[PDB]
Specification:
Chain H: Belongs to the complex I subunit 2 family. This is part of a larger assembly, with 10 protein chains of 10 kinds. With about 120 residues, chain A is mainly α. Helix content of chain A is about 50%, strand content about 0%. Chain A contains 2 helices and no strands. The radius of gyration of chain A is 25 Å and the shape is flat. Classes of the chains: A mainly alpha (about 120), B mainly alpha (about 55), C little secondary structure (about 55), D mainly alpha (about 450), E alpha/beta (about 325), F mainly alpha (about 100), G mainly alpha (about 100), H mainly alpha (about 350), I mainly alpha (about 45), J mainly alpha (about 140). The structure holds 1,2-diacyl-SN-glycero-3-phosphocholine and 1,2-Distearoyl-sn-glycerophosphoethanolamine.
């Protein structure tokens, strides 16, 4: 699938992206991102011989902040991308009724499928 | 007889010998340049005309 | 304490230029550990000119 | 179900921020608390499974295996000391957290809904087993054991992924219900034969079937006791659980394409019970015993009777308990003498006069003494396969005879007749091994009383 | 540490702490002859800092607590057991030789860092060049398998060939019997067990190999036996030395930047020390090394980054 | 003239007894081993085993058992008390079936 | 097809096989690289002239100046190899074995 | 070397690669590849040992002839329909020459003979930078000009690079050669799905770049060339061991770990077409290139080789290399599994 | 005390920690303000 | 090339015979010349008579396996009179592997070659029999 208005420049988040619902506070994905950031600060203590859980508390708070922020922007972009994919799908559905015909519901009083028993 | 020696010589050992021999004939190439460029040339000819890629 | 550990000969099984021995790979010598050969100092003399009597 | 997932996570930073003489009580106590916590689960009733979310659910195939897992962790965690208490504190903490992450992926695996998620959690079940058995493999070929291990399990389990993605984008999503309610039969074109072959062959590798059981014996003779109990009980019955689920699709060609595997399983069941009659390395007899019981499992899965699936799940749970117990007893004997061989450590009716009671009890369960569960399993599988054919009972009964004789040989070889009287170092039995035997053989007899729980979906 | 490019861009260059006193003077002498006597004399006269003798536990000396850490760790050298019995099959010549080689290399790096940082030049005693000559005479005695000497040749080829050799070298020649008399004057019995032909072979290689191979790299002044104290003469000779050859005249600044950024992070220096060749006289299996590393963690002042080290303090871990 | 090793002579076989004749399972720390015994029983049998025995000895009708007993009782009594044959074959209604034709 | 273009393409294959098979000296290889450069230059110039593709007629001289400074780099590399060795054969390079 | 000059050379590498990304004219793309070569040549020969000199010679020769054959492809494109817009081409022969130029450029199965030789005799920083930008520069071009390529070219080079970087790879303990054959195998994967969905190719490019940056950063933390040197890194420090474990397993691609995610999406949007046998072949050879990772892990952190004293000396100095950014890249590279629908962040 | 002739560091530098915590509070407040504007814009349009 | 593999598969199989074996020998000659061309590029024989000898051995052996494959293909198709199985080409691949082991004059290579060439040949005819495209859709 391709841009779809790369004409219409790169535009990290379009101004049509201010109609979708935003990712809320403490949504679980960015909670996971913050856990990853805490672990990144913790291994950041661990590479050098500075002791774990302590003497790096500003670095832990830093890595938490930065990863939660970056994940927040990417969550907004991700939601926009799925919205534009769904709307283009439904637009191509409605644009041509001629090729996606309605499967009339053959209910099971008349549908024949064989048996082939497992003894 | 059956489990140990034949089942190890059918499922692992065939694979291990195949991989070991093929390593020792792919990457056992001494380091000159004229070899690599003759390989390029025969690859270009055998990709253009013999097993064609532009037709 | 009875948990087995490999030996000098194990490590030398993983030692050498290449991994697998063949007929052909005796000549693969190990690289220098500093990635620096002891190069040829091929400059035997400077430019020696014999200006004669012309 | 997240009520079980999240304390199993939070048992992990526990083990980090405890100290010396402080990790142990916390881990063991809280793991037993989680065992009660999943003893709460068993509600399952009637119409269908029970759904723990838009994402998780439990078939009644999954409930006893899941409870078995949360039972088997604290037992294991007690069992794996005195062979590593003299190693370092950090490495010991890493060991305990490795097992907890292992249990976490096992719960993830058993409570799956989507078969792709099941596959991810299948190989996430794999990777701690590797690290445990290689880091404490305790003999000179733990190298080769881990190498054989991971390449058989992945290279069998690799195209299973391809087959499931193909089914994903030919029949919609992959709920077990929407795998059900929508499955249509698939005829005998050769692509169908290869697709069935891919799925069934990957789980065949994980059972093992007979032509792929030399995966096993290195990976149990050169393992520590924790990874061995894990590997045997949880991983082999995990492979069986996977085939039990995904055999719902592709019933109309399993009849035509199931003939070689049954015959492989039968003649290999006889051959494996024969090959564990004469080996040394007592630890390996339990491994070949496990291949014998899993061959009977595979017979029960490829025949498709509800009788057969009831017998299959009972044989799964009973053999898991028998093999895990008997591995723990063999580790007790190896803690006694530094041999692992069979004919060396002898006597022991005199000395440790109640260790022999546990040997006798496990040996008679592996005999399938009749009130136990293992006879329930084997008996219903024999009933179902005799309705399959009027001829296979030669093989089943001859399996019963040779199983009786090697199991009795394990009993009266090492623990009968004469101590070699140059041993003079074995200690009288600790409380710990007695506790481990007590934790195995109270639930086996307690299910021997009331076994209507552990029978499968086709109860 | 405030370095990398950015110190070299804030500060203009580094040649500004030069010269005529910022230099490397190095007293090479035979044992109990060319020592810290004349070295401290010329260091105090000439206005130039001094380095004590490179002992066994120098690496233990240069970090945090300068007490010698117990010789299970810094060993297993046992220099007095070397002067006792250089014939043991447990291996105590060459283990000690590798250890002293690493000690001389570390203290040379510390000296060259103190030269290139602010000056003002230093004296050294018994440098790394004297160390290989020392070992080759030890092999002339024949205490060592020749494969182990091949290993030493390998380590010597790798490590030394990135440095600048020192400026001036003061050779002290004392004959054999006077050194014999002096080691009798000191009275230490382990030192009294020395034999004289070992000392003679030291003098042999130390004249015959060292002098042709220095050759105006490390310009030399050769002095006699009672030519010691004698301070004014050697200070005077350095005063009119007329520096003639050597690679020190070709840096110009860029190699000096590389040497400042190389000699700092001494672990980058010592990333060629364990090569390995596995030398069954030398190496250590997993089990002994693991228990020794865990006991090295059990020290109260060595564990997890001496900067942030608790149980000495430091009350800045941000609560 | 060679050794290839330098380590301790191995093992060091510690009898876990002969410094404690009262000792339970693990190593020679005296009190916390007694705590190990007390936790693995009192939270391993005294709270797990007998409570699990009650809890799985009975709970409701797992997979609808006695529900099915009494429901079949009432249905067979009805199909005796209204004459019609018990367990009608052809479980789906043949009026609501359509055979495809030849 | 403006017939001459056939000959210049065949000349390109001449220069390319001369670049690929080469026996003794690296300098012959580098000079045949220069010849290949001349070939592309000429062919593109003929087409841009006969197209009257008059706006972007820079292609000949800019292609030229770039791949000529490539040849300058190649000259310096050959000087460095010839400086640390005696000669500049394709042989005496068999060290660093693959 | 001057540090100002190194900042200059990095500026020119970045200028060249950004020119390749950003331009729409064919002359500009060829300028971008040439300037990329000219700038990356003195990052190699950073020292002055003759190993780097022969490496740079081989690299210059093959790189420059790939550049000129690329220019041949462009002048064929103007021999046919002539305009300088980076679009669908107008000759199967031109597309053939052009993809063979890029296959020589980024390292590929007929053309990979300079990759281990260029990596073995160079330092670690040079190897890292050449892997990053010399795999990043052509992918933009191929992502552009995909709609006019004979497929058998791309698929042939993908398959054969995956199996060459497999089978070649079982034989080297020179860690630069191991990492180079790893580069070949992943570039086979990343060339493969170019004609199906290029989102997968670019995501795989991101994941591969971050993984190799983690691996080379771990080698730069303690300078090693052999596996035995990694065993000494076991003895001297323990956390480097578990990092080598995690990053080698994420090069191996196991489903608990983040390196599995590029395999899985490729197999998905490959097998929605009629290509099934080609996925199972690719993923079997992806099982193959895990084995040297596994023996490397067995060398480092799981068994332990005998150590040497003077590690006793190196205990007294705590570590003091700067990592450029190691831990951030590591747990960006390895715990990334529950963010697979950050797939569609990319298109 | 206890550290001969150099610690390489050990007294906490005060520009860097205050700078990082100030910019971390700044980035928190900036994303909070952006988020509140985004919630308001979503609810205002729909 | 596509022309001669197309000539091989265009024969109804079926029996239109000895054209099948001629096409299979042409396949063998082509494949032997390919792999021998890489080998003579990457060995430097010296003498050149050895180079011609090695290329002749490779071409001759690949043509031999092609001939034996086509022969037992034709014969099994005529005898069994059931042209749809892959079993007849399973016999084909095993016979080809056996004579590969014959012309290299060791028997274990012939055994493993029987197994793998039989499995590949059964899969080739079987995949033609169902229809699995060459390399692509490449649509969606
Ligand atoms: C063992 C290989 C298992 C590969 C996955 C299973 C599968 O679908 O195999 C069929 C595959 C290919 O068959 P297929 O999946 O292309 O089946 C035809 C499907 N339609 C009609 C939609 C085109 O078989 C092989 O690749 C043989 C090995
Ligand atoms: C039905 C499913 C069947 C799946 C079978 C999968 C392959 C079988 C298992 C492969 C690994 C076998 C193994 O571990 O063999 C051991 C051998 C190494 O043994 P050795 O030669 O002694 O090396 C000592 C090194 N110092 O290891 C080797 O030599 C490894 C050789 C490469 C094997 C890679 C994995 C298989 C790839 C097949 C591609 C075709």
């Amino acid at each position: 699938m391709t841009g779809r208005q790369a004409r219409a420049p790169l535009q990290f988040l379009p101004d049509e992206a201010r109609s979708l619902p935003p990712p809320k506070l403490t949504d679980p994905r960015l909670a996971y991102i913050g856990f990853l950031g805490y672990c990144s600060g913790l291994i950041d203590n661990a590479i050098r011989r500075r002791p774990v859980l302590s003497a790096g508390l500003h670095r832990q708070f830093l890595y938490i902040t930065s990863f939660v922020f970056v994940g927040y922007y990417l969550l907004k972009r991700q939601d926009y991308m799925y919205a534009v994919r769904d709307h283009d799908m439904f637009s191509y559905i409605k644009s041509h009724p001629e090729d996606f015909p309605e499967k009339d519901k053959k209910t099971y009083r008349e549908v024949f499928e064989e048996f082939h028993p497992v003894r | 007889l059956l489990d140990l020696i034949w089942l190890e010589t059918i499922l692992p050992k065939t694979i291990s010998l195949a991989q070991m021999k093929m390593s020792t004939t792919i990457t056992s190439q001494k380091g000159l340049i004229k070899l690599y460029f003759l390989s390029f040339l025969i690859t270009i000819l055998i990709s253009t005309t013999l097993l064609n890629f532009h037709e | 304490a009875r948990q087995w550990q490999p030996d000098v000969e194990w490590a030398e099984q993983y030692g050498g230029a290449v991994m697998y021995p063949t007929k052909e790979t005796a000549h693969w010598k190990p690289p220098p550990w500093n990635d620096v050969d002891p190069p040829k100092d091929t400059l035997v003399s400077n430019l020696t000119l014999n200006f004669g009597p012309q | 179900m997240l009520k079980y997932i999240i304390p199993t996570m939070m048992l992990m930073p526990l083990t980090w921020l405890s100290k010396n003489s402080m990790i142990w009580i916390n881990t063991t106590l809280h793991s037993l608390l989680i065992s009660l916590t999943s003893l709460l689960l068993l509600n399952q009733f009637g119409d269908n499974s029970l759904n723990f979310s838009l994402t998780f659910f439990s078939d009644s195939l999954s409930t006893p295996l899941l409870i078995l897992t949360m039972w088997l962790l604290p037992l294991m965690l007690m069992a794996s000391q005195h062979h590593l208490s003299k190693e370092n504190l950090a490495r010991k903490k890493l060991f305990i957290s490795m097992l907890i992450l292992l249990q976490l992926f096992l719960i993830m695996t058993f409570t799956a809904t989507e078969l792709i998620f099941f596959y991810i959690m299948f190989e996430a079940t794999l990777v701690p087993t590797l690290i445990i058995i290689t880091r404490w493999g305790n003999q000179t070929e733990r190298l080769n054991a881990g190498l054989y291990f991971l390449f058989y399990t992945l290279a069998g389990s690799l195209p299973l992924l391809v087959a499931l993605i193909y089914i994903q984008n030919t029949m919609g999503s992959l709920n077990f219900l929407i795998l059900q309610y929508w499955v249509q039969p698939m005829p005998n074109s050769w692509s169908n034969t290869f697709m069935w072959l891919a799925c069934m062959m990957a789980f065949m590798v994980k059972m093992p079937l007979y032509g792929l059981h030399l995966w096993l014996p290195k990976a149990h003779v050169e393992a520590p006791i924790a990874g061995s109990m894990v590997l045997a009980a949880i991983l082999l019955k995990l492979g069986g659980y996977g085939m039990m689920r995904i055999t719902l699709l592709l019933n109309p060609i399993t009849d035509f394409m199931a003939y070689p595997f049954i015959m492989l399983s039968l003649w290999g069941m006889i051959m494996t019970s024969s090959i564990c009659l004469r080996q040394t390395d007592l630890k390996s007899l339990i491994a070949y015993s496990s291949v014998s019981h899993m061959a009977l499992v595979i017979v029960a899965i490829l025949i498709q009777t509800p009788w057969s699936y009831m017998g299959a799940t009972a044989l799964m749970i009973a053999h898991g308990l028998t093999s895990s117990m008997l591995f723990c007893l063999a580790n007790s004997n190896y803690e006694r003498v530094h041999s692992r061989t069979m004919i060396l450590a002898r006597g022991l009716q005199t000395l440790l006069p109640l260790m022999a009671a546990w040997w006798l009890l496990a040996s008679l369960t592996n005999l399938a003494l009749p009130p136990s569960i293992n006879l329930i399993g084997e008996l219903f599988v024999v009933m179902s396969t005799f309705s399959w054919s009027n001829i296979t009972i030669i093989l089943m009964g001859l399996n019963m005879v040779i199983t009786a004789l090697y199991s009795l040989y394990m009993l009266i070889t090492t623990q009968r007749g004469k101590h070699t009287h140059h041993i003079n170092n074995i200690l009288p039995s600790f409380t710990r091994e007695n506790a481990l035997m007590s934790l195995h053989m109270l639930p086996l007899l307690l299910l021997s009383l009331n076994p209507k729980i552990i029978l499968g979906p086709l109860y | 540490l405030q370095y990398g490019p950015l110190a070299y861009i804030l500060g203009e260059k580094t040649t500004k702490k030069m010269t005529e006193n910022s230099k490397l003077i190095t007293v090479d002498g035979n044992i109990c002859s060319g020592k810290s006597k004349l070295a401290k004399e010329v260091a105090e006269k000439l206005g130039l800092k001094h380095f004590p003798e490179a002992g066994i536990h120098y690496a233990d000396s240069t970090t945090g607590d300068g007490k010698p850490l117990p010789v299970r760790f810094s060993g297993n050298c046992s220099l007095e057991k070397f002067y006792d019995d250089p014939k043991s099959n447990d291996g105590n010549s060459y283990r000690l030789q590798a250890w002293l080689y690493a000690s001389r290399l570390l203290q040379y790096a510390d000296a060259l860092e103190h030269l290139l940082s602010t000056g003002q030049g230093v004296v050294l005693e018994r440098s790394i060049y004297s160390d290989f000559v020392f070992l080759e005479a030890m092999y002339r005695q024949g205490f060592i398998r020749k494969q182990c000497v091949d290993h030493y040749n390998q380590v010597k080829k790798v490590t030394v060939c990135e440095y600048l050799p020192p400026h001036v070298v003061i050779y002290v020649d004392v004959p054999v019997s006077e050194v014999q008399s002096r080691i009798q004057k000191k009275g230490n019995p382990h030192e009294m067990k020395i034999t004289s032909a070992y000392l003679q072979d030291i003098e042999n290689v130390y004249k015959g190999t060292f002098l042709p191979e220095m050759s105006e790299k490390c310009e030399v002044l050769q002095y006699s036996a009672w030519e010691a104290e004698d301070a004014e003469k050697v200070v005077e000779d350095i005063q009119y030395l007329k520096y003639d050859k050597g690679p020190w005249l070709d840096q110009d600044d860029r190699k000096l930047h590389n040497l400042r950024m190389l000699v700092q992070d001494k672990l980058e220096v010592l990333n060629y020390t364990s090569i390995p060749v596995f030398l069954p006289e030398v190496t250590i299996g997993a089990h002994q090394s693991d228990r020794v590393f865990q006991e090295f963690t059990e020290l109260p002042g060595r564990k997890y980054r001496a900067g942030y080290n608790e149980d000495v303090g430091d009350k800045w871990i941000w609560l | 003239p060679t050794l290839r090793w330098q380590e301790d002579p191995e093992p060091e076989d510690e009898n876990l007894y002969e410094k404690n004749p009262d000792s339970h399972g693990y190593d020679k720390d005296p009190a916390v081993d007694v705590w190990n015994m007390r936790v693995v029983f009192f939270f391993g049998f005294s709270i797990v085993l007998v409570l699990g025995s009650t809890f799985v000895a009975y709970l409701p009708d797992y997979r609808m058992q006695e529900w099915a007993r009494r429901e079949a009782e009432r249905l067979v009594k009805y199909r005796e008390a209204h004459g019609l044959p018990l367990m009608e074959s052809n479980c789906f209604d043949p009026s609501k079936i359509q055979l495809p034709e030849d | 097809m403006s017939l001459v273009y056939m000959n210049i393409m065949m000349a390109f294959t001449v220069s390319l096989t001369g670049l690929l098979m080469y026996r003794s000296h690296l300098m012959s290889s580098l000079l045949c690289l220069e010849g290949m450069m001349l070939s592309l230059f000429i062919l593109a110039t003929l087409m841009i002239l006969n197209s009257h593709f008059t706006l972007a007629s820079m292609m000949p001289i800019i292609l030229l100046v770039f791949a000529a400074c490539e040849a300058a780099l190649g000259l310096s590399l050959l000087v460095m190899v010839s400086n640390t060795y005696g000669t500049d054969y394709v042989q005496n390079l068999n060290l660093l074995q693959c | 070397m001057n540090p100002i000059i190194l900042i200059i050379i990095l500026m020119t590498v970045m200028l060249g690669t950004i020119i390749v990304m950003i331009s729409t004219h064919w002359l500009l793309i060829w300028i971008g590849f040439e300037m990329n070569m000219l700038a990356i040549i003195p990052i190699m020969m950073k020292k002055h040992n003759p190993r780097a000199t022969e490496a740079s010679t081989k690299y210059f020769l093959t790189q420059s002839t790939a550049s000129m054959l690329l220019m041949m492809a462009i002048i064929i494109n103007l021999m046919f329909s002539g305009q300088w817009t980076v679009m669908k081409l107008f000759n199967p022969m031109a597309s053939m020459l052009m993809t063979m130029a890029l296959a020589m450029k980024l390292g590929m199965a007929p053309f990979h003979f300079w990759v281990p030789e260029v990596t073995q005799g160079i330092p670690l920083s040079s190897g890292l930078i050449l892997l990053t930008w010399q795999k990043l520069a052509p992918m933009s071009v191929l992502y552009q000009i995909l709609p006019s390529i004979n497929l058998d070219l791309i698929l042939t080079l993908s398959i054969l690079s995956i199996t060459i970087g497999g089978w070649g790879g079982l034989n080297q303990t020179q860690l630069r050669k191991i990492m180079a054959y790893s580069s070949i195998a992943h570039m086979g994967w990343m060339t493969a799905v170019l004609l199906y969905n290029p989102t997968m190719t670019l995501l795989n490019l991101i994941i591969y770049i971050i993984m190799t940056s983690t691996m080379f950063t771990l080698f730069m933390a303690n300078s090693t060339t052999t596996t035995l040197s990694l065993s000494h890194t076991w003895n001297k420090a323990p956390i480097m061991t578990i990092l080598v474990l995690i990053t080698l397993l994420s090069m191996g691609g196991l489903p608990p770990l983040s390196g599995f995610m590029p395999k899985w999406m490729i197999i998905q949007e490959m097998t929605k077409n009629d290509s099934i046998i080609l996925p199972t072949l690719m993923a079997i050879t992806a099982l193959l290139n895990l084995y040297f990772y596994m023996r490397l892990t067995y060398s480092t952190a799981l068994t332990m080789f005998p150590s040497t004293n003077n590690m006793k000396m190196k205990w007294q100095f705590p570590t003091t290399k700067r990592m450029t950014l190691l831990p951030t890249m590591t747990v960006l590279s390895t715990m990334l599994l529950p963010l697979t629908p950050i797939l569609s962040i990319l298109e | 005390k206890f550290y001969i002739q150099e610690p390489p560091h050990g007294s906490p530098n005060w520009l860097k920690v205050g700078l990082t915590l100030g910019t971390s509070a700044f980035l928190w407040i900036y994303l909070i303000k952006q988020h509140n504007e985004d919630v308001l814009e979503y609810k205002r349009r729909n | 090339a596509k022309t001669l593999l197309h000539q091989y598969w265009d024969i109804p199989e079926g029996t239109e015979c000895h054209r099948k074996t001629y096409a299979a020998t042409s396949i063998g000659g082509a494949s032997g010349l390919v792999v021998s061309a890489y080998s003579v590029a990457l060995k430097t024989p010296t003498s050149f008579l050895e180079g011609v000898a090695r290329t002749g051995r490779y071409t001759f052996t690949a043509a031999a396996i092609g001939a034996i494959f086509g022969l037992t293909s034709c014969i099994s198709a005529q005898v069994r009179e059931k042209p749809d199985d892959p079993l007849n080409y399973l016999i084909g691949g095993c016979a080809g592997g056996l004579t590969l082991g014959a012309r290299t004059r060791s028997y274990g290579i012939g055994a493993a070659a029987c197994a793998y060439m039989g499995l590949t040949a059964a899969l080739v005819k079987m995949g033609q029999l169902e229809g699995w495209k060459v390399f692509a859709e490449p649509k969606v």
